[PDB]
Amino acid sequence: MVLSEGEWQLVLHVWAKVEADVAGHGQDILIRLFKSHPETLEKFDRFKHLKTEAEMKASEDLKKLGVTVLTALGAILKKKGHHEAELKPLAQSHATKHKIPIKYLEFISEAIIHVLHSRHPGNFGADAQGAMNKALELFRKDIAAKYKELGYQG
Numbered sequence: 001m002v003l004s005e006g007e008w009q010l011v012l013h014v015w016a017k018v019e020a021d022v023a024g025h026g027q028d029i030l031i032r033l034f035k036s037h038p039e040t041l042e043k044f045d046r047f048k049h050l051k052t053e054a055e056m057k058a059s060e061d062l063k064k065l066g067v068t069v070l071t072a073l074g075a076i077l078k079k080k081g082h083h084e085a086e087l088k089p090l091a092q093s094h095a096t097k098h099k100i101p102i103k104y105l106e107f108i109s110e111a112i113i114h115v116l117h118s119r120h121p122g123n124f125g126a127d128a129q130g131a132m133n134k135a136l137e138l139f140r141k142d143i144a145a146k147y148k149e150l151g152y153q154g
């Protein structure tokens with residue numbers, strides 16, 4: 001699928017806001033995912049044991065992961081669709097080391113949208129949410145295609 005430039009602009013304008021606090025937004029997102037869809041936590045051997053939201057917030061390693069994930073995502077969004085080189089390593093580890101089904105990539109997309117909507121209401125009205133949704137769907141479509149070539153199809 002293809003985003004127009006005005007859609008990419010809506011995406012990169014709210015992302016610029018996220019980028020003022022990457023660690024705080026990575027924390028919010030992962031916790032939202034884990035609270036909404038607890039089964040997802042089972043994929044993380046390093047964080048599997050965290051029992052409450054308070055322990056998740058206090059986890060220094062979970063914060064460092066959140067930074068790593070948002071940074072990789074940010075790098076993809078900034079390519080505005082031309083993200084074939086960035087997607088390759090990401091799809092290989094998520095398909096063959098981590099084994100993350102597309103369904104879980106849908107769950108984290110929903111958590112990203114939930115946190116931007118709560119934190120950036122002024123820069124995340126309906127049009128901007130529509131554009132971010134389209135960018136994450138494009139992401140998911142391209143990753144699923146890569147999964148299939150890799151032998152996983154998730």
Ligand code: HEM
Nearest residue numbers: 040043044046068069072073090093094098100104105108
């Ligand atoms: C926006 C979508 C996502 C992005 C950009 C992303 C990015 C990354 C990156 C950059 C790393 C470290 C390098 C690597 O192992 O490839 C990582 C690790 C990992 N990811 Fe993802 N990921 C995403 C979605 C998810 C989801 C939905 C799951 C599970 C429900 C997941 C599970 C994991 C696990 C288990 C690891 C290893 C973490 C650790 O170091 O202990 N990922 N991810």
